[PDB]
Structure 1
Amino acid sequence: KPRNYQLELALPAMKGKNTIICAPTGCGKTFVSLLICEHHLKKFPQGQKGKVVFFANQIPVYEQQKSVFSKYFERHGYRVTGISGATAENVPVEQIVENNDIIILTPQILVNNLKKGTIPSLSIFTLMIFDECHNTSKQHPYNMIMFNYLDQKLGGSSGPLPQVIGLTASVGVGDAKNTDEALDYICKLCASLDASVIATVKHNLEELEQVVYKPQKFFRKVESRISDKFKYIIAQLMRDTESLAKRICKDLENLSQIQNREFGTQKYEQWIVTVQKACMVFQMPDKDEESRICKALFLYTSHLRKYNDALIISEHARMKDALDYLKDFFSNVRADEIEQDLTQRFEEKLQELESVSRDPSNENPKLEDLCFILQEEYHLNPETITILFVKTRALVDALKNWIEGNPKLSFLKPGILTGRGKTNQNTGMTLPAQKCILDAFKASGDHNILIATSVADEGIDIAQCNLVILYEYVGNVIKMIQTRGRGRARGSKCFLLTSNAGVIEKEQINMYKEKMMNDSILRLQTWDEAVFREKILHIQTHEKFIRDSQPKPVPDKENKKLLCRKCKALACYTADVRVIEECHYTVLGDAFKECFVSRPHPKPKQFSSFEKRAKIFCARQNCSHDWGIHVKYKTFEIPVIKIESFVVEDIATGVQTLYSKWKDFHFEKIPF
C-alpha cells in the first residue's frame, strides 16, 4: 500500500504539473514514479493513449526499473520495453518507441536518435521521468535532451510537449555563498527541467521520519605519522632517479612551471607529468638517439610516478601496502637495460625497506583510530554491517589486506567494490563481479564489511549498513545526502576519519549548503505558480540565447607523421588515416601492419558498430606502448588508434606536437 507521503509527492505530478520531487534516499521514489505513471496512462480517453519514457543513468538502475515497470503494468495492458547501449544498433528505434507505451531509456540513446532524426521531436512522448534529475547540468545527456525540449518550447514550432518529472534527493546549490545565490541555482535548475513545482514532504513529515532516519555523524580529526623512515628511503630513490634524468636532459628544472615540488604530493604528480610531455617532443637529428633519450626519460618519469604513488599510499595505509605496490610494479616491468638499472637500484634497498615495514613501531596512527572505531561498534553490536569509502582503488586493496592481516580484526570478513574501470585496460571490476559481492554483502551472507570507491548517485540498493566510514573521503552536498540512505534504520552511524582539516571543513560547508538548499526551497514553494513559471521563462530564454550565440576550424592539409610517444618510432602518416562515423580513426596500408602486435582484449564490449577483439601496442625494440585497439567493424577487422598514444611530427617544419583528443588535431580527414 502507498504511504501518505508518497501520495503527497505524486500530487503535483498527477495534476499535470512539471514537478521536481525532492525526497530522502530510501523513502520509495520508485513507487512514486509508478503512482504518477499509473495516473498518467489512465487519464487519457478511449481514442487517445499516453507514452512514458523513464531515464536511467546506469545499466543496473536501467535493468532494475525495467523489471519494476514491467511486472507492475503488464497486467494492466501496457507494454514496457528498454533500449540500452547493447540493443541500440540495427534496431528500428522509432517502431520500438511507437509500439510500446513505457520505454525505460538510457539518456544517450535518446540524444543520439534526436540527432540522427530517427526520433524527430519529443512530441512522441507525453511524460518524461528523469531519475537523479540534479544531473541536468553542463553537458550531461539529461541537459542535451532538455535543450531539444526547450528549443521546441521557445521556438514557433508547435506540438504538444511531454510532462517532465524529476526525482532527486538533493537539487544542490552549486558554489552558492548565501541564500540568494542558492535560490538562483535552484531556479536555473528548475528552468533546465521546465519545472513549475518542487515537491517535498511537508504534511506527513512524521510518517517519513518513522521510515527513514538520519544517521548521526562523527568527525574524527587525527594526526599524520611523525617519523617516516619509509619516506627517507623512497625520497632517495626519487632524487637518484631525478639525477639520472639530469645527466640526459640538462636544465630539467625549467621543463615545468611547477616550482618547489615535494615528494608524495599532487603537485609533484602534476610536475612528473609536465616533464613527461616535454621529453616526448625532443628532436634529435640522429632519429636513433632520439629513440634512446626519449625512451630513457619516459622510463624515469614512469618510475618516479610509482614512487610518488607509494609515498601517498604510505601516508594513508601501511608501509607494507606501499611496498607491495612497488613490488608489483617492478614485477610488471619485468617480463630493458634501463629498467634493470632502476630495478637494481631498488632491489638494493629492498631488504632495508622490508626491515622498516615489518617494524611494529612504524604503525599508521590513522589506521589505529580506524581500528579503534571498528573494534568499538562490533564489540557493542557484533552483527554490525559496515561499508568503508576510500578515495583511490589502490587504497581499497590496501585496506583489504590490512584488515585481513590484522589479528585485532579477525571478526571482519572484508569485501571489495570498485568501478568497472577503463574500457581498454584490464583493471577495475566487471559488472557480474560487482553484483556477486553485493549479494554476499548481507547480514546472512559471507562478508561483514565492504570497502568501496565512490558510487553513483544512489545506484542499486545494497544491504543497510548501521555503520558507514568515510576514510579521507569528502564530496559535495548531493553525495552527503545520498550516503544517508546507506543506513536508514535508527542507530545508523557515519564516521568521517581524516588527517586533513580541509576535509572536515568541507563537510561542515556541505551541511550549511543543505540548510540553504532547504530554506531556499521552502520560500520558493510560497510563490504563485504563475510567477514561478514566468521567472524560469527568461532563464530558459537567456540560457538559450547564450547557447544560440556560441567556430568551425580550418584544417591543415599538410601531411604529418605519427610517432610512438615512448620510442618515437614512425607508425604511419596522416595520409593512411581514415575516419569512421566522424568519431573513430583507423590506418590503411600494409606498412602499418608491420608496426604493431595484438593481445586479446580483456573487456570485449561493443559500441555503435564495433566488436572489440584485441589491444594493439608498439613492436619496435619491444616498446609495448599502448596504441589503441583492434576491433571488427561491420565488414572487416581493423585497428583503431587513439591520438593520445602518438606525437604528431610535421614533415617540413619538423615540429612535434601533442594532441589529447582527435577533435583538437586538424588535418585532412578522409571518410572510411
Structure 2
Amino acid sequence: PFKPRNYQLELALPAMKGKNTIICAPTGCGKTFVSLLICEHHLKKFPQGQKGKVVFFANQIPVYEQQKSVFSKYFERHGYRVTGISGATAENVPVEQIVENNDIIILTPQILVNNLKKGTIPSLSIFTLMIFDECHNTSKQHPYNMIMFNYLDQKLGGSSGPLPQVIGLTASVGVGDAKNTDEALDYICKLCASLDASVIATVKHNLEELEQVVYKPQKFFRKVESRISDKFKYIIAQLMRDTESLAKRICKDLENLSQIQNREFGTQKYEQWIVTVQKACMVFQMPDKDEESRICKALFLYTSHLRKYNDALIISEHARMKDALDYLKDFFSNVRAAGFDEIEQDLTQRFEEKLQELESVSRDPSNENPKLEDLCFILQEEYHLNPETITILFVKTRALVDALKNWIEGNPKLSFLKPGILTGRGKTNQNTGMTLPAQKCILDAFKASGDHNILIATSVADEGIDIAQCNLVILYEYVGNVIKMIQTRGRGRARGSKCFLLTSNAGVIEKEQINMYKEKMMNDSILRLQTWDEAVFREKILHIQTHEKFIRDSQEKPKPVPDKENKKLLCRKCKALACYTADVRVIEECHYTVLGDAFKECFVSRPKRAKIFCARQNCSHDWGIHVKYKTFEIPVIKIESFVVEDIATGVQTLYSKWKDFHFEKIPFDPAEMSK
C-alpha cells in the first residue's frame, strides 16, 4: 500500500468526520488518493450486517476508465464489488440491478440524470457517499447541477429519507463575474450552497511538503508589434472592394441590410456584417421567379467570396501568408469544380489576375509574422539550455494546429522538434475529428525519451486528461478565465518550469493580469470564510438554497404548439423548389426523409454513402446524404440547406436546427411507400 502524506491526511480529515467538504488543492498533489482514503474509511465504518454504497462521477470517458481501473485495483483485496457505466456500457444490463449488485460505481453524470428522469433510480438515498470530480462545474445547467437539484429538492421537501454525504474535489473554485472581494465571497458562498458544503479544506499546517511536491512555474508576458507593411492585405482589400461594388450593382440597398457601422476588412465585426447580409439576401422574394433566382444566386456567390476573403485575412494575421493563400486556393479549386457559371467564371478570373502577385508576396522572407519569429527565438533559447525539454503549445483553432505543425517542420532552425497533434473529437465543416484511440496513441507517444517532444493542442489538454510533465508552456494568443489559468499552470509542476504568453494585443496581457488579481481575491475570500462559525455558515447556505429553489420552481415554462399548415422548401442557393412538408417523414424521431418520386428528380447523387445535391445545373448545393435503415436506403436532408416559404402569407424564414422548425412531424412507415 502507498504511504499517505501528512497533507493528504489533513485534507481528508474533515471528510472522515462525515461533513460535506469541498477539497481545494493544487493539481498534481494526489486528490485521487485522498478520495481513496475517504472511501476506505467510509466503507469500514458500518456495523456488521450493514453496508454502504459509493458513487464516483467522472466527466470524460478516459477519466472514467482510469478511475474504474484504479478503484478496481485498490479495492480488489477487500472483497468489494466495483463496476462502471458509461455511453459504451449503458445498453447491456438494467442500471438498477447493476447499482444494487455493486458497492462502488463509477458513472458519467448524464447516465444518472437519464435514469433519474426515467424513474429507474427513484432517489439518491441508495448511495451513502457521493464524490464529484472537478466540483467547480456545479453551476448553471451542468449535469452536476441537475443531480444536485434532485438532492436539494429531496432535502428541502420534508421527505424524511437518508441523504448521502457529498465530497467535491477541485483546484480552483473561481470567482465568476466578481470585481471586488465581496462579490468573490458571494460567489464562493453560492458555489458552496450548490454542493451543500459547510467546510472548505485547504493545506495549512503542512505547506512545506506540498511545496516540495508541487512547484508553481514562473509566468512571463511577451508583447510583439504587428507587421509594418502588408501587401497581402492590400491586394485582398482591393479584391474585397471590387466584390462589394459588384454586389452593390445587383442590390442598391446593400448598406441598409445591417446596422453594423464602420466595418473594416479582416475583423470579426466584418464577419458579423457579412453573415447578416448573407442571411438577409437569402429571403428576398420577387413576383418574377427567374429574376429572384438569379439575383439570390449572385448575392450568394458574392457574399461567400467576401466571407472567404475575410477568413484568409484573419488566418494571415495569426499565421503565415502561405497558409491563407492555400486556403484561398483550395476554396477556388472547389468553386471551379462546383458549378462553374458566368459569375463564378468572372470571380475566378479576377482572382487569377492577382494570384501571381499574391504568390510573389508570400514567398518573401521579409514578410514573416513577428509572432512566429518570437516563438522560434523562445523555443531556441529554451531548448539550448535543456535539450530534454518537453513542451506543450496552446492555440485557438484547429487550422492553427496544422499551420504551426507545418511551420515547425519546414523551419531549418527548429530541426530538434518532433511535433504532435491533439484536437477534439467532433467533426466540423472543414476538419475531421480525432477518435479516442488516436488521442490515446498520441498521448502515450508524447513523453520524455519518446517520439515527440512538443505537443500542439487546442483546449482538450486543459482539464482532466493526464499528460506527461512539461518544462515549457507557451500560450499563443491564449487567455481564458481564472480556473483555466490555474489549471494550465498545473502542467509544469517540475522544478524550474516556465510559462510564456505570446500576443500582439495589449488587452490580452491586461486580461491575464486581471485574472492574476482575481486569484488573490479568491484566496482572500476563502481564508475569510474559513474563520466563521459553522452554524452561521450553515444558516447562510440554507437561506441561499431556499431562494434558489424558489426561483427555479417558479421559472418553469410551457411549450408552444406546432403549425399544421403546408410549407415549401427551397434551395438556399438558387431558390428552386425541393419538396413540401407534407412529404417529410421522421425515422425514430431523429432522421428526416422525403417520400415520393417527384423529389427524386429534384436532386442528383454523387459519391461512406453518397451525398445528394441540387439537381439544377450550375447550383449543386449540398442537401443531405444517403443512409441505410433496415432494408431501405433512403436519403436524409438538412434543414439548414433550405429556405422555408409559407404557401399563404409567402414570407420566408431560415432555421438552423430541426427543433426550431415547428410543423406536423409524421412518423415513417415501411408500408407507406406505395402511394
Q: TM-score range by the shorter chain?
A: over 0.9
**Are the structure 2 counterparts of residues 240 and 424 from structure 1 closer, same or farther at C-alpha, using a change threshold of 3 Å?**
closer
Secondary structure of 1:572's aligned partner: strand
1:84 CA drift (Å) = 1.7
Question: How far apart are residue 253 of structure 1 and its match?
Answer: 1.3
Structure 1 position 389, deviation (Å): 0.7
In 1, Cα distance between the equivalents of 2:145 and 2:627? 32
| Superposition deviation, residue 345 in structure 1 | 1.8
- Structure 2 counterpart SS, 1:207: helix
Shift of residue 670 of structure 1?
Answer: 4.3
Find out whether 1:657 has 2:656 as its counterpart.
Answer: no
Tell me how far 1:594 sits from its aligned partner.
Answer: 4.9
- The 8 Å contact of residues 225 and 370 in structure 2, kept in 1 or not, is answered as yes
Deviation at 1:158, TM superposition (A): 3.1
Deviation at 1:299, TM superposition (A): 2.5
Deviation of residue 48 (structure 1)?
Answer: 2.2
C-alpha change, 1:37 and 1:234, in structure 2 (3 Å) is: same
Compare 430-439 and 142-151 and name the one that shifted more: 430-439
Mapped partners of 2:204, 2:503: distance in 1: 36
Secondary structure of 2:563's counterpart equals coil
Q: From the superposition, tell whether residues 536 and 456 of structure 1 become closer, same or farther in structure 2 (CA, over 3 Å).
A: farther
CA contact (8 A) 1:579 1:671 kept: yes
Q: Please list every run of 5 or more consecutive structure 1 residues that lacks an aligned counterpart in the other structure.
A: 600-611
- Partner SS state of residue 196, structure 2: coil
Q: In 2 relative to 1, CA 579–179 (structure 1 residues): closer, same or farther, beyond 3 Å? A: farther
**Residue equivalent to 2:630:** 634
Q: In 2, are the aligned partners of 1:424 and 1:615 still within 8 Å (CA)?
A: no
| 1:425 to 1:17, Cα distance in 2 relative to 1, 3 A | farther
Give the drift of 1:6. Answer: 1.6
CA distance change for structure 1 residues 154 and 365 in 2, over 3 Å: closer, same or farther? same
**1:392 equivalenced with 2:397 (yes/no):** yes
Cα deviation, 1:448-487, whole Å, max 9, x if unaligned, reads: 2111111264222111110000011101000001111211
Aligned-residue offset at 1:44? 2.2
Q: Which moved more, 1:553-562 or 1:309-318?
A: 553-562
- The structure-2 alpha-carbon separation of the partners of 1:197 and 1:176, relative to structure 1 and needing over 3 Å to count, comes to same
Aligned-residue RMSD, C-alpha? 2.4
- Counterparts of 1:28 and 1:636, CA distance in 2: 54
Residue 591, structure 1, aligned to residue 598, structure 2: yes
Q: Report what 2:577 is aligned to.
A: 570
Cα 1:298/1:53, change in 2 over 3 Å = farther
1:641 CA drift (Å) = 4.2
Q: Counterparts of 1:65 and 1:666 in 2: how far apart (Å)?
A: 43
The alpha-carbon deviation at position 570 of structure 1 amounts to 2.9
Shifted more, 29-38 versus 415-424: the winner is 415-424
User: CA 1:224 to 1:88, structure 2 compared with 1: closer, same or farther past 3 Å?
Assistant: same
Alignment partners' CA distance in 2, 1:352 and 1:425? 27
- Distance in 2 between residues matched to 1:268 and 1:51, nearest whole Å: 56
1:416-449 C-alpha deviation (Å, 9 max, x unpaired): 2111133787523222222222222222112221
TM-superposition CA deviations, 1:68-92 (whole Å, max 9, x none): 2222223322222222223323641
How many residues end up aligned between the 2 structures? 659
Q: Distance in 1 between the 2:389 and 2:141 partners?
A: 41
Cα deviation for residue 642 of structure 1 reads 4.1
Check 1:596–1:86 CA distance in 2 against 1; reply closer, same or farther (3 A cut).
Answer: farther
Change (3 A) 1:613 1:471: same
- Deviation, structure 1 residue 637: 6.2
Instruction: Return 205-214 or 414-423, whichever deviates more.
Output: 414-423
Q: Using the TM superposition, give the Cα deviation of residue 493 of structure 1 relative to its aligned residue in structure 2, in angstroms.
A: 0.4
Look up the SS of the partner of 2:474 in the other structure: strand
* CA distance in structure 1 between the partners assigned to 2:120 and 2:635 by the alignment: 30
Q: Which residue of 1 aligns with 2:524?
A: 519
* Counterparts in 2 of 1:18 and 1:636: CA distance versus 1, 3 Å: farther
Shift of 1:635: 8.7
8 A contact 1:132–1:457 mirrored in 2: no
SS for the counterpart of 2:516 is helix
Q: Report how far residue 185 of structure 1 moved.
A: 0.7
> Whose radius of gyration is greater, 1 or 2?
2
Tell me which moved more, 290-299 or 20-29.
290-299
1:215–1:265 distance in 2 versus 1, CA, 3 Å: same
**Cα contact 2:569–2:644 (8 A) shared by 1:** yes
Post-superposition Cα deviations, 1:499-539, rounded to whole Å, max 9, x if no partner, equal 11110011101111111111111111112222212211121
Single out whichever of 638-647 and 146-155 deviates more from structure 2.
638-647
**Cα 1:313–1:540 shift into 2, 3 Å:** same
Q: Are residues 34 and 333 of structure 1, via their aligned partners in 2, closer, same or farther at CA, if it must alter by over 3 Å?
A: farther
Secondary structure of 2:140's match?
Answer: coil
More displaced 10-residue stretch of structure 1: 63-72 or 567-576: 567-576
Q: Give the Cα separation in 2 of the matches to 1:650 and 1:566.
A: 18
- Kindly tell me: are residues 558 and 375 of structure 1, through their superposed partners in 2, closer, same or farther at Cα, counting changes over 3 Å? same
8 A contact 1:25–1:458 mirrored in 2: no
State which drifts further: 55-64 or 511-520: 55-64
Alpha-carbon spacing, 1:634–1:222, altered in 2? closer, same or farther (3 Å): same
Structure 1 residue 552 displacement after superposition: 2.5
Shift of 1:613: 7.0
Deviation readout 1:136-195 (Å, 9 max, x if unpaired): 121111111211111111112332222222111111100101111001111111111111
Per the alignment, residue 132 of structure 1 pairs with: 134
Tell me by how many angstroms 1:41 deviates: 2.1
Over 3 Å counting, the alpha-carbon distance change for 1:568 and 1:180 in structure 2 is: same
Aligned to 2:262: 260
The answer to whether the aligner puts 1:58 opposite 2:60 as a matched pair is yes
Q: Is the 8 A contact 2:422 2:460 kept in 1?
A: no
Partner-residue secondary structure (3-state), 1:617: strand
Partner Cα separation in structure 1 for residue 9 and residue 614 of structure 2: 61
CA distance in 2, matches of 1:193, 1:231: 52
Separation in 2, partners of 1:567, 1:478: 48
Asked if structure 2 preserves the Cα contact closer than 8 Å seen for 1:54 and 1:128, the reply is: yes
CA contact (8 A) 1:19 1:166 kept: yes
Displacement of 1:614 after TM fit?
7.1
Deviation at 1:634, TM superposition (A): 7.7
**TM-score of the aligned structures, taking structure 1 as reference length:** 0.93
CA offsets per residue over residues 299-327 of structure 1, 9 Å max, x none? 22222222111111211221112212222
Cα distance change, pair 507–339 in 1 and its aligned pair in 2 (3 A): same
2:445 aligned counterpart, secondary structure: coil
Quickly say closer, same or farther: Cα 1:640–1:118, change in 2 above 3 A.
farther
Aligned equivalents of 2:283 and 2:622: distance in 1? Answer: 18
